[PDB]
Structure formats: structure tokens, C-alpha cells
Design a binder for this molecule. Structure first.
Ligand SMILES: *[C@@H]1O[C@H](CO)[C@@H](O)[C@H](O)[C@H]1NC(C)=O
Lengths: 48, 47
């Protein structure tokens, strides 16, 4: 028998790589429905 | 193509019951990038 989880203990003295590192993953999905997120369309000063 | 488009017009009228003989065109109200099928609709009324 084992409990299926374990806590990390992070204490500030640990070596590099034993330290806590936040992660975020931007997963994204494509083109089966209307384009609904995208970047700022860069724009420039108006000339005539 | 998944876009849901509403067009609309408001006007004053002074008439008893029927849809009025006359001409007017609906301006576009809003367009929503929804991406759902629609095959049936229903209306919401005040009690
Ligand atoms: C809308 O209907 C088509 C044909 O059945 C289907 O391929 C499509 O996946 C449906 N869209 C959704 C969001 O279920």
C-alpha cells in the first residue's frame, strides 16, 4: 500500500534544479471555428 | 460560417395591429464569432 501523492518540500537552501519552478503552457487550437484570439495588428502614423 | 449576425431597426408607428405597408432597411447591429450550429429558436417574453 502507498499514498499515490508526495509533497515537495522546497526550502530556499536547495541546489539549482532542486528549486521550485513555476511553469505555464499555452496550448492552443486551430481553424475548426472562427479566429477568436490573436495579436495586436501593428499600425503606423497616417499619411495623405 | 460560425459568425452570428444581428441586423435591426427601430421606428415610431401609430397603427392598430398589422405589419405596416412602407419601406425601411435594417442596419447591422452586431456580429458574434460564436461557432455553433443553430436549427431551432425560441422567444423570451415579459409576464
Ligand atoms: C455542426 O453540424 C455538422 C454536421 O453534422 C458537424 O460536422 C459539426 O461538427 C457540428 N458542430 C458542432 C459544434 O457540433
Amino acid at each position: 500500500c502507498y499514498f499515490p501523492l508526495q509533497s515537495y518540500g522546497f526550502q530556499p537552501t536547495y541546489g539549482v534544479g532542486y528549486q521550485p519552478y513555476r511553469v505555464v503552457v499555452l496550448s492552443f487550437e486551430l481553424l475548426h471555428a472562427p479566429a477568436t484570439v490573436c495579436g495586436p495588428k501593428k499600425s503606423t502614423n497616417l499619411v495623405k | 460560417d460560425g459568425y452570428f449576425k444581428i441586423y435591426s431597426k427601430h421606428t415610431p408607428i401609430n397603427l392598430v395591429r398589422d405589419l405596416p405597408q412602407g419601406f425601411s432597411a435594417l442596419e447591422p447591429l452586431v456580429d458574434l464569432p460564436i461557432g455553433i450550429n443553430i436549427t431551432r429558436f425560441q422567444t423570451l417574453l415579459a409576464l
